[PDB]
Design a protein around this ligand. Structure first.
Ligand SMILES: Nc1ncnc2c1ncn2[C@@H]1O[C@H](COP(=O)(O)OP(=O)(O)OP(O)(O)=S)[C@@H](O)[C@H]1O
Ligand SMILES: Nc1ncnc2c1ncn2[C@@H]1O[C@H](COP(=O)(O)OP(=O)(O)OP(O)(O)=S)[C@@H](O)[C@H]1O
Ligand SMILES: Nc1ncnc2c1ncn2[C@@H]1O[C@H](COP(=O)(O)OP(=O)(O)OP(O)(O)=S)[C@@H](O)[C@H]1O
Ligand SMILES: Nc1ncnc2c1ncn2[C@@H]1O[C@H](COP(=O)(O)OP(=O)(O)O)[C@@H](O)[C@H]1O
Ligand SMILES: [Mg+2]
Ligand SMILES: [Mg+2]
Ligand SMILES: [Mg+2]
Lengths: 327, 330, 290, 426, 332
DNA sequence: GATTCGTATC
DNA sequence: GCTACGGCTATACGG
């Protein structure tokens, strides 16, 4: 029944050896568990970095056949108020071991979305039952956590997945699904994911769906761009060239052609232009300020809706005005 | 009877036009059973609800639809308590056993779909409870989040759900559908018509269908039997006539504050909308080759700022007067 | 239908299901269905588990037409089922418990000639964890005691009345045919103990082992520190019981078998609190010397 | 072997650390409330913490209650910790007030209510308000005098979801007692002020002279004067001052002297934002300390309205119009930030910076006032009632609907000059 | 009783001030079955509500102008409701911010081509519109909403997409003068000359309601007569705004700013909308001949910035005082 | 914290 | 017949 699953859920690692990328964290937690003592962990980083697939694999490797009665998992999908923390967590972390297997792991996923009162009531539970219970905290935003809670928690930072790890996972997915992927399409997947395994898995699933024959046909870069409606680098470069060099009429015509022939959204083009403009000379310091401020204002306006033609004209005019400080 | 928008709503996935990528992904996953969590987004009136309803009726069938589909939108409460109780309980429920007829004439996938339309209006507090809900109950339940602004969707939910974007229905996308509707409704139009309808209804087809229906009703009431002209659908939509626009431009050229204020007062007396006149001014000024680059940049930024202010819900008169004064003093 | 069982007596099954009321009042329960009968397993906070068995002989039209699975499991709520089985009577209401395999409601058809009430409940997926985790190990049983239901029920009611924030279990046997079994309560009033009688009518048997379940030792006291919020979960279960059997091993797992067709068997398991304070055990031992 | 705020406690009225005028007015009010006539029934004492708001009532009762009592001495303080078996916690105060009304003749005893019931809970709060309201309006010919010492304190930040407001911000008398009680003719609210430096120094010197052997033994009697001056100048709390003095004296070392930090009042905070602080000449430090110590006051929209309504006090309002324009523009910008703490920081930093570059010596300043927004909202509610009545009578006579906007703009003004001007003719 | 209600047309043919709009309404009423959701946008005083009433009478026959006032209750939001045969009135003014729940309940109760009229749709909050964008689309077989608003700018894009845009131009001077002549013919006032009606029309700025009310007020003041030099009875708040404009253009000081703030507080206590207060202050400031073109441009720029700020803000006093301070600094 | 008035005292 | 108990209920508190 695992085939009738999304690729982001049936490719979830079950062992620590399948969690690519976070090599330092994996090695450190392996040393901790091999040496017995495991400090109170706190996993932080961008979403989709493997902060849950790592802790669940660690729990499975520690409590073999006992992942159920030794691990208590609470997330934002369930209530985690004062009453919950003071009753359920306390009762679970205050009782003796089932078979004297070790310590009782408590996984608190998405602990950032927790009230400060609960985060302060949890600290004494963490410190007073640390002999037989070790707490793990998963959070994407560190500012939501009490500084004392951060103090009484060893911090492991799950950085965005490097290119090598995502490439290895893509290779494994290709082998498991009997698929073919072009290297350019793989690089496009790398740049689209921007450090997120779930994005890569979803785009690969959509590409396999988009193929007439998922067996004898290879997922090309054009498929990877069409399945997500993302702008190709060529059209972004053409738009940037038209805005920077040609007059106002031809630049507007090119922008309309690019956004119409492929249906590309304006915000995606704005992000692409921002990325292509980062590795630019721009000797004058005012050009950078004008570009960043005007493009951020236009992106904020787009996030609230409006007239796409006016916003595109604003983009063109802003870029031209910012690059007039060049000469 | 029924409005033309609801009368020609796509019933099956083969009727949704110009959304080729998402619709073909859904059609291909219809054969299989690996449909992932979906995040439909795009301009208003692009065919998200129609597409999801068509997929729902194709996968399960009318009888299985009620027992295997839950729909929640802005019309109902979607708070943190609702997400925590109703959505979670529905997802936990085992999928109902299809009947023999359902298995014979429908794919009947082993999962069920929770449709959360207009999800951009859901608070970030209630969007954090869906994260694990759409992840642990993934092999028995599927989630379809529909919204107009992806920015309102938190990053975790956007990462968990597949990103399907619905393209804007321009005059080269929904023209076939509009012509089909006109032919089915026996509508007489001149050459070039329905193109202005798609252009005025930019990034939307429901507005275009409504405009076509209103023009058809007007033509029927007239009794002349002649085809519908472009100026009719232009005036009916609310587009400012070109003579009024050129008079506005001429008043702008003569940088007299009193004359501009008087003519803006007269224009607001006429009752036109600020958004339409601003859009038409943009189309006139940007396209005109007589102006130079610096003036075009400044006027583009001024129009952007004016539209941003108007979208916030401000007085049209003051914004229009300030914009025209700025254009005059340029 | 794969499963279909008809019963005429509803008060018995009503009381059996109401024995699970002190647990989660409105939550999910798991129902295993096999040839022997149907069972009800409820677990709270992974610290206490209760199992209720209803034998085939209790019913009168047990079929179990399923063949593809040895046992059939389904997850449903508790409040709705208890309310349905609380139909009482005026003419016997013959229940028609049924379950048509996967993706089918657990239908409870009640027929009373004049009334043809039919109730259906949708099934939830699974508790999704290894339920058999609270089972005691039958090699290191520290002590094994049997107490009548009324005495234990009265003791638990008395503890509930006086608060009893935390509870202790004291068991000791002497070679002079003097066996002591009592419960200590850490309540707002301090440390209060309830000494059960040594008479065989109340305490039929008490054997304190040495972690081997075979050798009986004398003079050694087994201390069990259990949170009362889980110890009162079987307070009403012993009210309808005749004999109650106690079993605790060195792993800090309590096992209470409740028995009242061969009746109803209620097999519950409890975890033991970690007993952080070292002087707590010492002061309990000192108090027990009086 | 005990705390110095005890043992060295006042024994007579003279020892009480209170100003002469405050003592005389409190004694006058008590003497008026002990007469057979009952012009004033309750005395609502209020003030900051530890401002001799409790130690004076007992001393007054020592020489007042026995004089007017009958023959055939102290207070009857309400204990909020007595959990009666067959009595709900709300009914505890009800029983207290219903049994304290029997002390009139031969049983006279002042009723002191310092520890209020859990007024943070809405139900018992309104029950207490009703109970004290019944006391004022009671048909009882004779009632004993009653004193409610509401110690005002700034309630800190809390995790309560909404629970209205007022009692979640401050513990003042207005947040417990309602407007009907405050404006009642039989209520006399005598507010108290922080203890002045002179009386604090006098009482600290009295404590020091009453115990000097250990002071000279620990080479502290010669350093006593500086310690007393610093303690009496840093805090206005007598009990806290005595505790700090005891802690310093009993200690043996070089531990710095510290005391509780007072919370800046609303008008005080407005003055600090507008004018500045003489203690600290660094704007950043002052603003940071103000936000850290009192963030429950700078977060309310009243403080921004307070600045808007009170920035015209600098130099009596003779400052440049550009400064006022900048201040109001930044206030509007902060209002346009949906209450972010950054907006709260900026809206005060800009005002303080603007009022620093134009600070001119020898310029008299005016007085401040609370923002005139409650009056405006009451007038708006009155206009709402008027418009509702006009639209109600309009629809009842003729079938014509009129939008509330048009009623405010056109109908409301012309309705009198039409209807009543034709009533003249009839 | 009132002349506005006395001379209110009760049918499509009775309407004689738009012509083209009346013909379009006839076209819409020719087929009452396929009635799309209608959104009337135009200047206030045009007669959009009267046009909606006339259209409903055309669809639902006579008796539309009936007035079945009743009181409802929502959770205690006890908003009054004006019911009529196949016609219900909803005013977003009576419930600000909290309008979503009450409009949801009213819509679901009406659903049970019934028409519900929601005037001044601009006052609807972004949440009520969020509910309505699905309420209209879902139950579009048993209810047809018709909404009239002054300007559709604060209306979300989906609602404008699902509804039909119909423009209602303000009455012209000649036709409104003709309407005034008909009024003074039906109830004789013995006008000295018809020029006074034209001057009243010019002083109404296309607001027929304002023209009728001021004509009735002047007739009552002059004892059912009219005079060539009869004073124009403008609303009091407009006079107060003109006085405030004079104070601003005369006293450029901080004490004058305090006086202006007091005047603004009085205006707000008169329940006058802040946006229209800012608009009238700006336009009165632009009418002063002493100020030069640069000053007027600065005035209009500040007005735009501060009305945007007021739209994106809770407290209205701050923005008005800021605009006054900015214009005062510009003057000197 | 700033203003105005008011005693009380060295 | 009265009891001791099961179910009902008014309710102070809960979050
Ligand atoms: N290192 C990895 N190697 C392979 N797949 C990975 C890796 N990290 C994440 N994934 C995949 O991404 C999915 C989501 O990751 P999770 O660990 O469940 O969530 P997360 O990474 O903690 O992000 P958040 O903050 O919880 S939304 C997993 O189920 C895997 O399929
Ligand atoms: N791709 C399409 N093909 C055919 N008709 C379409 C398409 N997209 C939209 N429509 C028409 O649009 C109407 C229904 O659109 P909806 O899907 O309800 O709007 P939407 O895409 O959900 O945008 P909203 O309502 O602002 S969330 C019907 O009249 C359809 O015929
Ligand atoms: N000279 C003195 N003057 C005043 N209080 C004194 C003095 N010497 C000792 N004390 C003690 O200091 C304390 C001050 O009590 P009060 O201030 O009257 O009570 P309070 O004002 O109600 O304080 P709160 O509001 O409860 S914090 C009492 O405990 C007194 O016994
Ligand atoms: N065609 C017309 N002829 C005469 N009077 C009219 C006409 N249309 C509208 N009116 C007048 O307008 C008044 C109502 O205006 P209203 O609908 O409130 O305007 P708005 O919809 O702009 O608020 C009525 O009193 C009526 O006398
Ligand atoms: Mg996770
Ligand atoms: Mg939709
Ligand atoms: Mg006291």
């Amino acid at each position: 029944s695992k085939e009738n699953l999304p690729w982001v859920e049936k490719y979830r690692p079950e062992t620590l050896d399948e969690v690519y990328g976070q090599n330092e964290v994996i090695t450190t937690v392996r040393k901790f568990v091999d040496e017995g003592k495991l400090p109170h962990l706190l996993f932080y980083g961008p979403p989709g970095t493997g902060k849950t697939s790592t802790i669940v694999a660690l729990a499975r490797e520690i409590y073999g056949k006992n992942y159920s009665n030794m691990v208590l998992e609470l997330n934002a999908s369930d209530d985690r108020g004062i009453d919950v923390v003071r009753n359920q967590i306390k009762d679970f972390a205050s009782t003796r071991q089932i078979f004297s297997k070790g310590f009782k792991l408590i996984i608190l996923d998405e602990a950032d979305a927790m009230t400060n009162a609960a985060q302060n009531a949890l600290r004494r539970v963490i410190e007073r039952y640390t002999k037989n219970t070790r707490f793990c905290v998963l959070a994407n935003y560190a500012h939501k956590l009490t500084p004392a809670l951060l103090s009484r928690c060893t911090r492991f930072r799950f950085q965005p997945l490097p290119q090598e790890a995502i490439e290895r996972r893509i290779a494994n997915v290709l082998v498991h699904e009997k698929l073919k992927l072009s290297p350019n399409a793989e690089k496009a997947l790398i740049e689209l994911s921007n450090g997120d395994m779930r994005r890569v898995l979803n785009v690969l699933q959509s590409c396999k769906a988009t193929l007439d024959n998922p067996d004898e046909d290879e997922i090309s870069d054009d498929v990877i761009y069409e399945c997500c409606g993302a702008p190709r680098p060529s059209d972004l470069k053409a738009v940037l060239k038209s805005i920077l060099e040609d007059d106002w009429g031809t630049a507007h015509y090119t922008l309309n052609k690019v956004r119409s022939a492929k249906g590309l959204a304006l915000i995606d083009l704005i992000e692409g232009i921002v990325k292509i403009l980062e590795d630019y000379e721009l000797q004058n310091e005012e050009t950078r300020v004008h570009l960043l401020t005007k493009l951020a204002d236009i992106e904020y306006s787009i996030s609230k809706g409006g007239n796409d033609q006016i916003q595109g004209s604003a983009v063109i005019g802003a870029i031209k005005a910012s690059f007039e400080n060049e000469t | 009877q029924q409005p033309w928008v609801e009368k020609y709503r796509p019933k099956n996935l083969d009727e949704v036009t110009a959304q080729d990528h998402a619709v073909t992904v859904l059609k291909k996953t219809l054969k299989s059973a690996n449909l992932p969590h979906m995040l439909f987004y795009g301009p208003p009136g692009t065919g998200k609800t129609s597409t999801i309803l068509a997929l729902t009726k194709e996968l399960y069938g009318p009888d299985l639809m009620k027992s295997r589909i839950l729909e929640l939108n802005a019309s109902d409460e979607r708070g943190i308590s609702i997400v925590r109780e109703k959505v979670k309980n529905f997802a936990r429920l085992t999928v109902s056993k299809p009947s023999k007829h359902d298995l014979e004439n429908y794919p009947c996938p082993p999962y069920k779909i929770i449709i959360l339309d207009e999800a951009d209006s859901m608070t970030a507090d209630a969007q954090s409870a869906l994260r694990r809900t759409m992840e642990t109950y993934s092999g028995v339940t599927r989630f379809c989040l529909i919204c107009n602004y992806v920015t309102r969707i938190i990053d975790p939910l956007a990462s968990r759900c597949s990103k399907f974007r619905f393209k804007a229905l321009d005059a080269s996308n929904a023209i076939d559908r509009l012509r089909f509707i006109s032919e089915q409704e026996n509508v007489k139009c001149d050459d070039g018509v329905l193109e202005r309808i798609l252009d005025i209804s930019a990034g939307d087809l429901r507005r275009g269908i409504t405009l076509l229906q209103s023009a058809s009703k007007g033509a029927q009431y007239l009794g002349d039997g002649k085809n519908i002209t472009s100026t009719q659908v232009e005036e009916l939509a609310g587009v400012v006539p070109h003579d009024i626009l050129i008079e506005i431009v001429e008043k702008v050229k003569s940088g007299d504050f009193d004359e501009i204020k008087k003519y803006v007062n007269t224009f607001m007396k006429s009752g036109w909308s600020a958004a339409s006149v601003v859009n038409q001014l943009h189309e006139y000024y940007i396209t005109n080759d007589n102006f130079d680059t610096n003036f075009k940049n400044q006027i583009s930024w001024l129009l952007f700022t004016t539209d941003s202010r108007l979208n916030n819900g401000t007085n049209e008169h003051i914004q229009l007067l300030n914009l025209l004064v700025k254009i005059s003093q340029l | 239908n794969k499963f279909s069982a008809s019963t005429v007596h509803l008060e018995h099954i009503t009381t059996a299901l109401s024995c699970l009321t002190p647990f989660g009042s409105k939550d999910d329960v798991l129902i295993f269905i096999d040839a022997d009968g149907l069972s009800f397993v409820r677990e709270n906070n992974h610290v206490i588990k209760i199992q209720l068995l209803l034998s085939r002989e209790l019913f009168m039209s047990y079929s179990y037409r399923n063949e593809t699975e040895d046992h059939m499991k389904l997850c449903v709520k508790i409040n709705h089922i208890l309310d349905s089985v609380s139909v009482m009577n005026r003419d016997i209401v013959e229940c028609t418990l049924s379950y048509d395999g996967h993706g089918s409601p657990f239908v409870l058809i009640f027929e009373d000639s004049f009334i043809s009430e039919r109730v259906e409940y949708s099934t939830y997926l699974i508790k999704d964890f290894d339920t058999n985790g609270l089972e005691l190990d039958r090699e290191r049983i520290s002590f094994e005691a049997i107490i009548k239901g009324e005495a234990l029920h009265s003791a638990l009611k008395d503890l509930k009345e006086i608060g009893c924030k935390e509870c202790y279990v004291y068991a000791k046997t002497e070679a002079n045919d003097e066996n002591v079994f009592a419960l200590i309560s850490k309540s707002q009033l301090g440390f209060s103990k309830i000494k059960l009688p040594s008479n065989r009518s109340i305490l039929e048997k008490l054997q304190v082992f040495d972690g081997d379940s075979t050798t009986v030792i004398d003079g050694f006291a087994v201390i069990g520190f259990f949170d009362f919020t889980s110890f009162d979960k079987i307070r009403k279960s012993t009210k309808i019981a005749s004999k109650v059997l106690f079993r605790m091993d060195v792993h800090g797992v309590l096992s209470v078998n409740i028995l009242s067709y061969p009746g109803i068997v209620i097999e519950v398991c409890m975890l033991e609190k970690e007993s952080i304070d070292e002087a707590a055990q010492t002061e309990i031992e000192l108090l027990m010397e009086t | 072997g005990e705390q110095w705020y005890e043992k060295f406690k006042p024994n007579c009225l003279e020892q009480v650390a209170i100003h002469k005028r405050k003592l005389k007015d409190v004694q006058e009010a008590l003497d008026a409330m002990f007469l057979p006539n009952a012009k004033h029934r309750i005395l609502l004492l209020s003030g900051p913490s530890g401002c001799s708001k409790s130690t004076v009532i007992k001393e007054l009762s020592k020489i007042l209650v026995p004089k007017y009592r009958q023959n055939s001495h102290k207070v009857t303080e309400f204990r909020g910790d007595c959990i009666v078996n067959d009595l709900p916690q709300m009914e505890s105060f009800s029983e207290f007030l219903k049994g304290a009304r029997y002390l009139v003749m031969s049983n006279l005893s002042l009723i002191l209510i310092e520890d209020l019931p859990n007024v943070f809970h809405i139900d018992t709060r309104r029950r207490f308000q009703q109970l004290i309201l019944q006391w004022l309006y009671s048909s009882e010919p004779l009632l004993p005098p009653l004193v409610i010492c509401i110690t005002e304190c700034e309630i800190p930040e809390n995790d309560n979801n909404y629970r209205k407001f007022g009692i979640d911000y401050t513990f003042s008398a207005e947040t417990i007692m309602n407007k009907e009680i405050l404006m009642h003719p039989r209520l006399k609210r005598i507010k108290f002020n922080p203890i002045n430096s002179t009386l604090l120094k006098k009482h600290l010197k009295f404590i020091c002279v009453q115990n000097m052997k250990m002071l000279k033994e620990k080479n502290k009697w010669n350093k006593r004067q500086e310690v007393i001056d610093y303690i009496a100048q840093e805090t206005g709390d007598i009990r806290s001052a005595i505790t700090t003095l005891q802690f310093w004296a009993t200690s043996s070392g070089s531990l710095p002297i510290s005391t509780r930090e007072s919370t800046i009042s609303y008008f005080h905070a407005i003055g600090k934002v507008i004018h500045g602080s003489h203690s600290t000449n660094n704007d950043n430090e002052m603003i940071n300390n103000l936000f850290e110590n009192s963030n429950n006051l700078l977060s309310k929209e009243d403080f921004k309205l307070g600045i808007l309504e009170n920035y015209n006090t600098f130099n009596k309002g003779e400052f440049s119009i550009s400064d006022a324009s900048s201040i109001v523009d930044c206030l509007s910008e902060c209002d346009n930030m949906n209450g972010l703490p950054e907006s709260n920081e900026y809206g005060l930093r800009e005002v303080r910076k603007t009022f620093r570059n134009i600070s001119k010596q020898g310029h008299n300043h005016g007085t401040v006032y609370f923002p005139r927004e409650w009056k405006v909202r009451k007038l708006q509610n009155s206009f709402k009632v008027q418009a509702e009545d006009w639209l109600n009578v309009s629809l009842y006579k003729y079938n014509a609907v009129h939008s509330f906007r048009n009623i405010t703009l056109e109908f409301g003004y012309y309705a009198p000059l039409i209807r009543k001007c034709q009533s003249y003719k009839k | 009783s009132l002349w506005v209600d006395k001379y209110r047309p009760k049918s499509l043919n009775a309407l004689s001030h738009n012509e083209e709009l009346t013909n379009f309404l006839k076209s819409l009423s020719d087929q009452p079955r396929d009635l799309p959701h209608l959104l009337l946008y135009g200047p206030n005083g045009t007669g959009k509500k009267t046009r909606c009433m006339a259209l409903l009478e055309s669809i639902f026959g006579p008796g539309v102008y009936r007035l079945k006032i009743d009181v409802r209750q929502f959770v205690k939001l006890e908003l009054n409701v004006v019911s009529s045969p196949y016609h219900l009135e909803i005013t977003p003014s009576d419930m600000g911010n909290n309008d979503r729940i009450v409009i949801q309940e009213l819509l679901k109760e009406v659903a049970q081509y019934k028409c519900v009229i929601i005037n001044e749709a601009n006052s609807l909050t972004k949440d009520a519109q969020a509910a309505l964008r699905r309420t209209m689309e879902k139950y579009s077989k048993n209810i047809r909403l018709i909404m009239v608003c002054d300007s559709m700018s604060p209306i979300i894009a989906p609602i404008k997409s699902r509804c039909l845009l119909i423009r209602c131009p303000a009455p012209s001077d000649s036709e409104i003068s003709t309407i005034l002549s008909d009024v003074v013919t039906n109830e004789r006032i013995q006008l000295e000359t018809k020029d006074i009606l034209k001057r009243i029309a010019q002083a109404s700025n296309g607001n027929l309601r304002v023209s009728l009310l001021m004509l009735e007020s002047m007739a009552l003041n002059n004892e059912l007569a009219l005079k060539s030099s009869s004073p124009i009875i403008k609303p009091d708040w407009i006079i107060v705004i003109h006085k405030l404009t004079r104070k601003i253009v005369k006293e450029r000081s901080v004490n004058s700013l305090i006086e202006c703030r007091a005047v603004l507080y009085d205006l707000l206590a008169h329940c006058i909308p802040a946006n229209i207060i800012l608009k009238e202050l700006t336009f009165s400031l632009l009418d002063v001949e002493t100020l030069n073109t640069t000053n007027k441009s600065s005035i209009i720029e500040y007005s735009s910035v501060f009305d945007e700020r007021l739209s994106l803000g809770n407290k209205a006093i701050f923005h008005l005082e800021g605009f006054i301070a900015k214009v005062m600094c510009c003057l000197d």
